[PDB]
Amino acid sequence: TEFISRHNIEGIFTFVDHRCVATVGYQPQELLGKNIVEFCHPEDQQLLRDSFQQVVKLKGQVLSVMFRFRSKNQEWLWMRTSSFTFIEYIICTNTNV
Amino acid sequence: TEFISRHNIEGIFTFVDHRCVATVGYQPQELLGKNIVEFCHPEDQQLLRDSFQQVVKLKGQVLSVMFRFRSKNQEWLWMRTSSFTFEYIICTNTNV
Amino acid sequence: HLENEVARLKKLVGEKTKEIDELTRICADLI
Amino acid sequence: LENEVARLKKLVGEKTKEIDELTRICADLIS
Secondary structure: OOOEEEEEEOOOEEOOOOOOHHHHHOOOHHHHEEEEHHHHHHHHHHHHHHHHHHHHHOOOOOEEEEEEEEEEEEEOOEEEEEEOOOOOEEEEEEOOO | OEEEEEEEOEEEEEEOOOOHHHHHOOHHHHOOOOEEEHHHHHHHHHHHHHHHHHHHHOOOEEEEEEEEEOOOOOOOEEEEEEEEEEOOOEEEEOOO | HHHHHHHHHHHHHHHHHHHHHHHHHHHHHOO | OOHHHHHHHHHHHHHHHHHHHHHHHOOOOOO
């Protein structure tokens, strides 16, 4: 019920594995090239941006933010993304609860 | 210019990526189920074997051993193996 | 004639899938 | 039936690109 995503500094999907379809319903092609914020609930959207602003200054540290994800079937999913940085790219582990 | 191998506790190949063919000449089917020592130079078998006994006591820490690997064409290749443990052992086998 | 193509391609896919499955496990592990 | 090999050649290309991306990642978070 989780998938490994790989973003840049702004949060654009640069890589998504095959397990997204099972976890959110979207296909890798449907996620690639778009920001994760676009899929984030507007109510807790700023929070996602705040978490992403932090992983950048905290080079190497691991962070954890939980937010709502818009599934493919237009339904909200609480997603726990535990992300960190490598700056080259950002690795995210998006877990479904 | 290297490939990631994944052994068990004793060092038998449990997983090899496609890059074995370019770096060593062997195919994934030809390595799996087989011990890594079998491809090692008799001179450096003791070293590689001792190095494998070490990665376990290091618990997560990374070791680096250099030995001769017998390629598909029956010639020795100096290999820089950067290995550590997680259950299983992951190796980054570099060709120099 | 072309059936031998689809057959070798279906197999090739199966191989690349098993590699993806193991590789994903490794990256999922080193976290 | 040509439409199979065409979609399989494509599917292979996608799965080939995925392991390269996966391998590059796993090779990185080892250092």
